[PDB]
Amino acid sequence: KVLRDNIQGITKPAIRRLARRGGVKRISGLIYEETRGVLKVFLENVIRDAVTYTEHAKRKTVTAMDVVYALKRQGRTLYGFGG
Amino acid sequence: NIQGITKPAIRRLARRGGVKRISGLIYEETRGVLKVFLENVIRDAVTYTEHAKRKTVTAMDVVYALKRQGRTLYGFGG
Amino acid sequence: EGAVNLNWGTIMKTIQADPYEFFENGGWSFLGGGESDDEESEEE
Amino acid sequence: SRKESYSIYVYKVLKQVHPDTGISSKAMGIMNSFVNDIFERIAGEASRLAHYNKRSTITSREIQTAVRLLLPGELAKHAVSEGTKAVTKYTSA
Amino acid sequence: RSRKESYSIYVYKVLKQVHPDTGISSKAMGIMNSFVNDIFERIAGEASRLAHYNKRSTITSREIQTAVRLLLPGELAKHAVSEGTKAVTKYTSAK
Amino acid sequence: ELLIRKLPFQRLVREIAQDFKTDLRFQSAAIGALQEASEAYLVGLFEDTNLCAIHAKRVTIMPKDIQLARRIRGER
Amino acid sequence: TVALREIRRYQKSTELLIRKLPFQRLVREIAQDFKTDLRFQSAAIGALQEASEAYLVGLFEDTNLCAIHAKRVTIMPKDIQLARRIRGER
Amino acid sequence: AKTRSSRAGLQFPVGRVHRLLRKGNYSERVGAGAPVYLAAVLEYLTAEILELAGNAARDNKKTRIIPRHL
Amino acid sequence: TRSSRAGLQFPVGRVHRLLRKGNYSERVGAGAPVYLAAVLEYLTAEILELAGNAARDNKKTRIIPRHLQLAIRNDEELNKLLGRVTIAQGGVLPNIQAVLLPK
Amino acid sequence: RNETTNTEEEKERLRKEIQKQLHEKIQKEGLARFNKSDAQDGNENHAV
C-alpha cells in the first residue's frame, strides 16, 4: 500500500497549538499551509540522511541512532533517546 | 581605539551591504557588535597561542579560531 | 512560574465577581502549577 | 549484553548533591547523552589541537586548553580549578 | 629548506585541462588549496564517524562514497559518485 | 506533551520515507525522536515569526514573516 | 542618488573599507586585556579585518532585510537587535 | 586505594575513560592525567547541573527529577 | 605512479599518507584514496570551470579571488555547499532591493 | 566551587523562604481586606 497526501494529517488545531506554545496570539489562514510545506522540507532533509545511514549499515530498519546521527549532522543534537 | 572606526567607515560598510538610509545610533550599535565579535575571536586566538607556548599571534591561530566559530576563511593558509 | 500563558482577562473577571471566595479557596496558590505534593517516582 | 552507561555515577553524584532527590529514567537517559556528547566534544578538540601542533599524545594541557575554549568564563575557571586540584591530588597520592 | 606541500601544481594542471587559455593568481591558488584541504577534512571526518558507528577499523571506498552522498547535494553528489566509481573501476581493471 | 497526533505523524513519516527506499521499517523511538525534533523546530520557528510580527507592530503572524525568519536563519 | 551611486561603487570593489592603523590599534587595545606583550603577524590583522568586514556586511544585509520588512528605508538599532536575536547571537 | 578514581578522589571511572580515549582513535599516545582531568571536569559539570535541577524540582514540590526540570 | 594507473592527476600516495597520518582509522583500504581523489578532482574541475567562465565574462585571462567568489555564490549547489565560508577579496554579489530603487 | 554553590543555594533557600512568607502574608492580607459581609452586599452591575 502506498501513502498519498498525508500532509493534511497536520490538522489546523495542531498548528494552532504549536503557535500558542510559540506565543502567537492571532494567526493568518495561509500560515497553516506555509508551515506544512516548511515541515515537509525539514523532514525530507532529515530522513534522507537517516535513510542514508540505515542503508550504509546494510540494514533494513531505521533505528533511533540513525535519526540521532542525522540530527547531530545538522547541529540538532537531541538528548533523551540515546547519545 | 574604538573611536578609530569612524562614521564614514560604517557608512561605507552599509553601502556595500545595500543600505540606503542610516540612523544616528547605528554607529554606536555597530561599534558594540564589532567589539563583541573581536573580543571572542581574539580570545580564542590567544588561547591557541598560549597553548602553542608562543608570544606572537600567527595567522594559523586566527584561522583555527574562525574555524572554531564556524566562519571558515580561505586564502590564509588553511 | 508557569509553562503556559494564562487568560488573565477571564481570571480577573472571576476574581472581581467574588474576591472573598477567591481568597477562601487558597487565593494565588493555583498559579504554582499543580499542587500534587507527592513523589513523582517516574523511574521504575 | 552488558551495556555501559553513566547512571550509577549520576546516582552517586546526585546523592552527594541532593540526598533526598531522585531521578527519572528519562532524565538519566538525557544525562548519559550529555556526558557522552561532552566527552566527544572534548576529545575531538584535543585531537584537533594535537594535530595542529604536530603532537601524538593527549596530555592534561590539551584537555585544559580545550576546557578553556569550550566553557564560558566562570564555568571555565571553576572547571579548570577542579581539574587541576584533582590531577594534583592524584599525582601526590 | 622548508619543503611544505600544496595542491598548486595539480590545480594548475586541472585548470589547463578545463581552460587552456586561462591563468590563475597566487591568492586564488591559495584559496583553492585551502578549499581542497577543507573538503578533504570534512570528508575524512564524516568517513571516520561512519566507520566508528559501524564498528570497523578500515576506511574503504564504501565509507567515502556514503560520506560523499551525505555531504554533497543531489546532482553534485551523483556526478561525484559517477566520477569516483569510474576511476575506481578503471584503476582496478588494470594493475 | 507532544501536540501532533502520533499516528498521522507516523503515516506522514512513512509516506516521506517511501521515496528514498521502498518498504522500510522504523523503530518506534525513531518516530518519537522525529516528532520531538519537529515540534521543537517548529516552536523555535514560531518564536522567530512572532518576533518578526511584533517588529512589524502587528500581532498576527503572516507567511512573509516565516519567509523572513527562514531567510535570516539561512534556510533554503 | 549619491547613496545608490555609492552602493553600486562598493558592491563592485573588494578593497578593505577600514583604515589599517585604526584597526591595528583597536586589535592591540583589545588583546592587551588578555595578555601583555603580545605580537601579531600582519597577516593575522589582515585576516581579522577581512573576517570582521565580511561579518559586518552580512549583518547589514540582514538588517536591511528587517528594515524593508517593517516598511522602512532607514535601519535602526532595533532592527540590528532583532536580526542578531533571530540569528541566535543575542 | 586500588581504583584510580579513589587515588584521585573521584566518582567517575578513570579506567573506562582511559579505555575510551585509547580505543577511540584520537591520538597515538595518551597521558596519565588527561583521563583524571577529564573525569574531574565531567563530574563537576554533572554536579553543577544536578544542583539546579534539584532546585527546580524542589520549587515544583517534586522529589523526582524529570526532563522538565533539566 | 598510482595516479597514472587510475588515469588521474591528483596524487594517490600523498592522499594515502595524509589519511594514514591523520588518525582516522587503524587501517585504510586501497579504494578509499582513489575514490576521494576522484571526487576532489571533479569538484576542483567544476570550480575552475565556472571561475574561468566568470573571468572571461570580465574579459580577464587570469583567475582572481573575485571570480572564485562570483562562481561560488552564483552556483546554487556550490553556494549551498560553501555556505559558511568567506573569501578574502571576494566581495559581494551586486544586489539592490526592489523597494530601494528610485522612482 | 562546591562550597560557594552550597552558600549560593542556601541564600536561594532563604529566597524561597521569603517567597513562601510573601504568599502566606498576601493570603491573610486578602482574607482581612475582603469580609463575608462585603460578599453578601454584591453590587450586581445590572446593566444600567
**Distance from C-alpha of D75 to C-alpha of J1, rounded to nearest angstrom:** 10
**Distance from C-alpha of H56 to C-alpha of H52, rounded to nearest angstrom:** 6
Q: Mark out the alpha helices in chain D (DSSP H runs).
A: 7-17, 25-52, 60-70, 73-92
Task: Tell me if D58 sits within 8 A of H26, measured CB to CB.
Answer: yes
Task: Tell me if D20 sits within 8 A of H61, measured CB to CB.
Answer: no
Cell 477562601 maps to which residue?
Answer: C24
Q: How many CB atoms lie within 10 A of CB E77?
A: 17
Per the structure, the complete domain to which residue B33 belongs is given by 1-78
DSSP chain F: ---S-HHHHHHHHHHHHTTTSSS-EE-HHHHHHHHHHHHHHHHHHHHHHHHHHHHTT-SEE-HHHHHHHHHHHT--
Element spanning D22, H or E: strand D22-23
Taking domain I1-103, whether its CATH number is 1.10.20.10 is answered by yes
Per DSSP, I88 falls in state T
Distance set, CA E40 to CA A36, B78, E35, I35 (Å): 37, 12, 8, 12
One-letter amino acid of B18: G
- Angle, vertex CA D6, rays to CA D1 and CA D8, nearest 5: 95
Give the CATH class of H3-70. Answer: mainly alpha
CB proximity J5 to H under 8 Å: yes
Task: Tell me if E38 sits within 8 A of I40, measured CB to CB.
Answer: no
Which residues does F75 contact at the CB level (< 8 Å), separation at least 6? none
Residues of chain C in contact with residue J26, where contact means CB-CB under 8 angstroms, are: 27-28
Task: Tell me if G45 sits within 8 A of G30, measured CB to CB.
Answer: no
Q: Do C42 and H59 touch (CB under 8 A)?
A: no
**Distance from C-alpha of A74 to C-alpha of A46, rounded to nearest angstrom:** 8
Residues of chain H in contact with residue C36, where contact means CB-CB under 8 angstroms, are: 61-62
How many CA atoms are closer than 13 Å to the CA of H9, on its beta-carbon side? 13
**Distance from C-alpha of B11 to C-alpha of A12, rounded to nearest angstrom:** 46
Task: Spell B28-52 as b/e; 16+ CB within 10 A means b.
Answer: ebbbebbeebbeebbbbbbbbbbbb
- Reference H35, options D42, E21, F31, D24; nearest CA is D42
Residues of chain D in contact with residue J8, where contact means CB-CB under 8 angstroms, are: none
Which residues does G18 contact at the CB level (< 8 Å), separation at least 6? B5, B9, G49, G52, G53
**Interstrand relation of F60-61 and A26-27 (parallel, antiparallel or unpaired):** parallel
Q: Give me the torsion for CA of I57, I62, I67, I71, rounded to 10°.
A: 80
Q: How many CB atoms lie within 10 A of CB G78?
A: 15
The C-alpha cell of C11 is what?
A: 481570571
DSSP A16-82: HHHHHHTT--EE-TTHHHHHHHHHHHHHHHHHHHHHHHHHHTT-SEE-HHHHHHHHHHTT----SS-
Task: Spell D12-49 as b/e; 16+ CB within 10 A means b.
Answer: ebbeebbeebbbbebbbbbbbbbbbebbeebbebbbbb
**Distance from C-alpha of H30 to C-alpha of D62, rounded to nearest angstrom:** 11
Which residues does H4 contact at the CB level (< 8 Å), separation at least 6? D90, H14, H15, H18, H35, H36
Interface of J with D (CB under 8 A): 1
Nearest CA in chain I to B77: I88
Q: Give me the torsion for CA of E9, E13, E18, E24, rounded to 10°.
A: 40
Cell 523503530 maps to which residue?
Answer: F27
Q: State this model's resolution in angstroms.
A: 3.9
Please give the CATH superfamily to which domain D1-93 belongs: Histone, subunit A (1.10.20.10)
Q: What is residue B78's three-state secondary structure?
A: coil
Task: Tell me if F20 sits within 8 A of A48, measured CB to CB.
Answer: yes
C-alpha Rg value of chain J to the nearest Å = 21
Which residues does I4 contact at the CB level (< 8 Å), separation at least 6? none
Q: What is residue E4's three-state secondary structure?
A: coil
C-alpha Rg value of chain G to the nearest Å = 16
One-letter amino acid of B8: P
Nearest CA in chain J to C26: J27
Q: What is the CATH number of the domain that holds G9?
A: 1.10.20.10
Which residues does J40 contact at the CB level (< 8 Å), separation at least 6? none
Q: What is the CATH number of the domain that holds B67?
A: 1.10.20.10
- Angle, vertex CA E90, rays to CA E86 and CA E94, nearest 5: 170
Which residues does I24 contact at the CB level (< 8 Å), separation at least 6? E44, E47, E48, E51, E59, H25
Distance set, CA J19 to CA B53, G48, H69, J13, J31 (Å): 52, 50, 20, 10, 18
**Distance from C-alpha of H64 to C-alpha of H45, rounded to nearest angstrom:** 20
Task: Spell I87-100 as b/e; 16+ CB within 10 A means b.
Answer: bbbbbbeeeebeeb
Q: In which region does residue G37 sit, left (phi positive, over 0), alpha (psi from -120 to 50) or beta (all else)?
A: left
The answer to whether B and I touch (≥3 CB pairs < 8 Å) is yes
At what angle are helices D7-17 and H34-59 packed, to 10 degrees? Answer: 60
**Distance from C-alpha of E73 to C-alpha of E81, rounded to nearest angstrom:** 11
First to last CA, chain F: 29
In chain I, how long is the greatest CA-to-CA distance? 67
Distance set, CA J36 to CA C13, C26, C27, J28, J42 (Å): 19, 15, 15, 14, 10
Which residues does I85 contact at the CB level (< 8 Å), separation at least 6? B72, B73, B74, E35, E38
Distance set, CA I86 to CA B67, E36, I90, I94 (Å): 11, 15, 8, 16
- Chains D, H: CB pairs < 8 Å: 150
- Most J CBs within 10 Å: which of C18, C20, C22, as the mutation test of the J interface? C20
The answer to whether G and A touch (≥3 CB pairs < 8 Å) is no
Per DSSP, C10 falls in state H
Q: Do B38 and G48 touch (CB under 8 A)?
A: yes
CB proximity B22 to G under 8 Å: yes
Q: What is residue A6's three-state secondary structure?
A: coil
The answer to whether F and B touch (≥3 CB pairs < 8 Å) is no
CA distance B41 to chain I (A): 15
CA distance H29 to chain D (A): 4
**Distance from C-alpha of D60 to C-alpha of B57, rounded to nearest angstrom:** 23
Per DSSP, I99 falls in state G
Q: Mark out the alpha helices in E1-95 (DSSP H runs).
A: 8-18, 26-53, 61-71, 74-93
- Reference E38, options B75, G42, G41; nearest CA is B75
Beta partners for B57? G40
- Reference E36, options I39, J27, C16; nearest CA is I39
CATH architecture of E1-95: Orthogonal Bundle (1.10)
Q: Give me the torsion for CA of D3, D7, D9, D11, rounded to 10°.
A: -150
Neighbors of chain E with 3 or more C-beta pairs under 8 Å: A, B, I
Residues of chain D in contact with residue H31, where contact means CB-CB under 8 angstroms, are: 57-60
Distance set, CA G44 to CA B75, E76, G40, G48, I88 (Å): 12, 34, 6, 6, 13
Cell 554533572 maps to which residue?
Answer: H46
CB proximity C27 to J under 8 Å: yes
**Distance from C-alpha of H34 to C-alpha of D59, rounded to nearest angstrom:** 5
**Shortest CB distance from H70 goes to which of D18, D27, D63?**
D27
Beta partners for F60? A26
Q: Mark out the alpha helices in G1-90 (DSSP H runs).
A: 2-12, 20-31, 42-69, 77-87
Task: Tell me if A56 sits within 8 A of D9, measured CB to CB.
Answer: no
Indicate the domain borders of chain E.
1-95
The domain total for chain A is 1
Cell 544525562 maps to which residue?
Answer: D31
Beta partners for A61? F25
Which residues does G51 contact at the CB level (< 8 Å), separation at least 6? B41, B62, B66, B71, B73, I86
**Interstrand relation of F25-26 and A61-62 (parallel, antiparallel or unpaired):** parallel
**Distance from C-alpha of A64 to C-alpha of A81, rounded to nearest angstrom:** 7
Neighbors of chain H with 3 or more C-beta pairs under 8 Å: C, D, I, J
Q: Give me the torsion for CA of A29, A31, A37, A38, rounded to 10°.
A: -170
Task: Tell me if I10 sits within 8 A of I41, measured CB to CB.
Answer: yes
Q: What is residue E20's three-state secondary structure?
A: coil
**Distance from C-alpha of H14 to C-alpha of J24, rounded to nearest angstrom:** 50
Q: Do H26 and I24 touch (CB under 8 A)?
A: no
- Reference E27, options E9, E43, E8; nearest CA is E8
